[PDB]
Each structure stands twice: as structure tokens, then as C-alpha cells.
Amino acid sequence: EIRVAEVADAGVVAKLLRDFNTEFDTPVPEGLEERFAQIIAHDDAFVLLAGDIGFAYVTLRPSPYYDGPVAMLDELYVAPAHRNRGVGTALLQRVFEEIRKHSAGELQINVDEVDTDARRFYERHGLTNIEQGSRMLLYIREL
Amino acid sequence: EIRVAEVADAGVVAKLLRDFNTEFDTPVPEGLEERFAQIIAHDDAFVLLAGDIGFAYVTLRPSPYYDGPVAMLDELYVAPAHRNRGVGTALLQRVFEEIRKHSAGELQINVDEVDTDARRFYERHGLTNIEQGSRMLLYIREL
Numbered sequence: 001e002i003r004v005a006e007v008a009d010a011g012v013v014a015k016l017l018r019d020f021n022t023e024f025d026t027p028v029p030e031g032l033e034e035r036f037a038q039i040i041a042h043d044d045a046f047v048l049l050a051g052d053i054g055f056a057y058v059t060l061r062p063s064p065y066y067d068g069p070v071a072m073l074d075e076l077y078v079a080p081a082h083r084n085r086g087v088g089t090a091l092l093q094r095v096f097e098e099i100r101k102h103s104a105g106e107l108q109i110n111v112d113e114v115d116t117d118a119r120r121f122y123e124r125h126g127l128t129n130i131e132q133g134s135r136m137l138l139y140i141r142e143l
Numbered sequence: 144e145i146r147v148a149e150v151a152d153a154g155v156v157a158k159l160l161r162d163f164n165t166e167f168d169t170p171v172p173e174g175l176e177e178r179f180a181q182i183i184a185h186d187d188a189f190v191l192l193a194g195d196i197g198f199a200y201v202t203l204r205p206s207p208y209y210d211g212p213v214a215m216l217d218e219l220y221v222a223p224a225h226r227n228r229g230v231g232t233a234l235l236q237r238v239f240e241e242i243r244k245h246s247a248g249e250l251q252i253n254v255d256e257v258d259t260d261a262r263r264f265y266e267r268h269g270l271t272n273i274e275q276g277s278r279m280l281l282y283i284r285e286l
């Protein structure tokens with residue numbers, strides 16, 4: 001039931017991303033569907049879909065530390081009514097399986113500190129916030 | 144002046160990243176020069192050089208939220224003897240200038256929490272760790 005999205009799946013992915021943003025009261029730009037179609041077709045990136053009820057969006061970017069890329073799980077979402085039944089675990093498992101085909105050297109994920117359920121999920125599935133004895137922070141500037 | 148690194152500059156970039164790692168007692172991979180030569184040749188990353196004494200390494204990756212990329216400042220370093228004189232400020236200004244040429248929608252930087260002096264620098268130059276009243280964290284798994 002997890003599969004790799006094709007270009008023609010961009011509409012379902014965009015709908016799920018819209019739902020994710022709506023759940024968190026964050027507005028979305030126009031054009032999500034068109035942009036996902038281009039990303040899936042041409043870029044060093046992929047989307048995994050669990051039926052039409054969850055997705056994972058992964059980007060691959062270069063690193064001097066590895067022959068392969070660094071992977072980033074830029075979005076992971078399971079629809080609220082389908083949570084706590086193993087869908088997110090299955091998506092994350094498949095993320096690790098797919099990035100291994102690309103010999104990715106590392107997976108990175110940005111998470112809000114307040115999102116303790118997501119944090120617990122990631123910690124229980126092998127991700128850490130600690131490097132060289134310190135927490136790792138994300139700083140941004142929107143442009 | 145600050146310049147965009149060419150493939151011919153891979154050795155200098157590799158030297159600076161090795162120096163950075165050595166200073167912080169972090170592992171140094173084999174093959175840095177050859178990997179930077181390949182990375183610099185491609186279209187989704189660049190390095191800025193301040194003479195031979197500082198550098199910024201930036202990657203670009205797709206996002207459904209913008210027509211342009213999300214930019215990541217994966218490494219920023221000024222040699223110890225040249226710090227506190229405005230070099231890092233100049234490098235970061237040029238990062239913003241060059242990613243604006245790419246119409247990048249956002250700059251992201253991962254920073255260790257213990258690096259309070261670096262965090263002060265990023266905050267003074269328009270970066271934020273806060274989204275909707277929460278700090279943002281980075282989780283990783285090395286593979």
C-alpha cells in the first residue's frame with residue numbers, strides 16, 4: 001500500500017499537504033499541484049503515498065561527506081483518522097528503504113519542539129536531536 | 144573579495160572544511176577534494192570563498208511552496224585568525240545575494256545549540272529559530 005508517487009499523483013499529494021497545513025492553521029500558496037508534478041518528474045526528490053491517506057516527501061541534495069546524497073524528509077503526514085495504526089511507521093520505513101537505493105549517507109528531519117508526539121515517533125524510530133553532545137537547532141529566514 | 148568557487152578551487156574548499164572539522168574534533172571523510180570538485184560542477188550547490196580564509200557551502204533543493212528552491216547553508220566557516228572582522232557577515236550577505244539570483248524562497252541553517260556565539264551572529268542577521276512560538280529542531284540518522 002505504500003508506493004512511489006508518479007507525476008499523475010500530484011493532485012493527491014497536494015490535497016494531503018493542504019490538509020496538513022489546514023490542521024495547523026497555516027495558509028498555503030497557490031500551485032502546490034503544479035509544483036509537485038514538476039518535482040516528481042524532474043528533481044532529485046520523491047513522494048511516497050499510503051493509499052490516499054498519507055505521504056512522505058523526500059529531497060536528496062549533495063554532501064561532501066558521502067558519495068551519495070543527504071536525504072531530508074521535508075514532509076511526513078498521515079490523515080488524523082488513520083493515525084496510531086502503523087501508517088507513519090510504514091512510510092518512514094519505506095523512506096529509509098528508498099534512500100538506501102540512492103546510498104544516502106544521512107536522513108534529516110526538521111521538527112517543532114512543541115510537537116512532542118512527532119518527536120517521540122522519530123526518537124523511537126532511530127532519529128536523534130543530539131550531535132557532539134548538543135541539541136541541533138534549525139534557523140530560517142523566509143524570503 | 145568574496146567569489147563563487149570554481150572547480151579549480153576544490154582543494155582550497157576541502158582544506159577549509161578539514162580545518163573546520165579538525166577545530167571542532169569532528170570526523171573528516173576521505174575524498175573531500177574530489178567530492179567538492181564534483182559538487183561545484185553541478186547546478187544545485189555552490190561555495191563562496193573569502194580569499195583562502197573562509198567559505199560558505201550552500202545547497203538548493205525543491206519545495207512545493209515556491210517556484211524557486213529552498214536554500215540550505217550547510218557549512219559556514221572563517222579561519223580563527225580572521226574572525227570578528229566582518230568576514231562571516233560578508234559571506235552571509237553574499238549567500239543571500241546569490242540565492243536571490245535563484246529566487247530561493249527560504250534559507251535554512253542547522254546550528255548546534257551550544258554554539259551561542261554563532262547563534263548570536265545568525266540572529267543579528269535576520270535568521271530565526273522560532274515558528275509559531277516554538278523552537279525548531281533538527282533530527283538526524285547517520286546511515
Ligand SMILES: CC(=O)SCCNC(=O)CCNC(=O)[C@H](O)C(C)(C)COP(=O)(O)OP(=O)(O)OC[C@H]1O[C@@H](n2cnc3c(N)ncnc32)[C@H](O)[C@@H]1OP(=O)(O)O
Pocket residue numbers: 073074075076077078079082083084085086087088089090109110111112115117118120121122124
Ligand atoms: C517531517 C515533518 O513534516 S515534521 C513532523 C511530522 N508530521 C506531523 O507531526 C503531522 C501530524 N502527525 C502525523 O501526521 C502523524 O502523527 C505521524 C506521521 C507523526 C505519525 O503517523 P502515525 O500513522 O500516527 O504513526 P504510527 O501509527 O506508525 O506510530 C504512532 C504510534 O502508534 C502506535 N502504533 C504504531 N504502530 C501500531 C500498530 N501497528 N498497531 C497499533 N498501534 C500502533 C505507537 O504507540 C506509536 O507511538 P511512538 O511514537 O511512541 O512509537
Ligand SMILES: CC(C)(COP(=O)(O)OP(=O)(O)OC[C@H]1O[C@@H](n2cnc3c(N)ncnc32)[C@H](O)[C@@H]1OP(=O)(O)O)[C@@H](O)C(=O)NCCC(=O)NCCS
Pocket residue numbers: 219220221222225226227228229230231232233253254255258259260261263264
Ligand atoms: C560563526 C562565524 C562563521 C562568524 O564569522 P565572523 O567573521 O566571526 O562574523 P562577523 O565578524 O561578521 O560577526 C561577529 C560575530 O561572529 C560570532 N563569532 C565570532 N567568533 C566566533 C567563534 N569562534 N565561534 C562562533 N561564533 C563566533 C560572534 O557572534 C561575533 O559577534 P560578537 O562581536 O558579538 O562577539 C565564525 O566565527 C566561525 O567560523 N566560527 C567557528 C565555526 C562556527 O561556529 N560556524 C558557524 C556554524 S553554526
Ligand SMILES: CN[C@@H]1[C@@H](O)[C@@H](O[C@@H]2[C@@H](O)[C@H](O[C@H]3OC(CN)=CC[C@H]3N)[C@@H](NC(C)=O)C[C@H]2N)OC[C@]1(C)O
Pocket residue numbers: 065070106131136163164167169216217218219220252253254255258283285
Ligand atoms: C552527522 N550529520 C551532520 C549534520 O548534523 C550537519 O551538521 C551541521 C553542519 O551543517 C555544520 O557543522 C559544522 O559546525 C561545527 C560546529 N559545532 C562542527 C562541524 C562543522 N562541519 C554546522 N552548521 C554550519 C552552518 O556550519 C552545524 C552542524 N550540526 O551537517 C553535516 C552532517 C555530517 O551531515
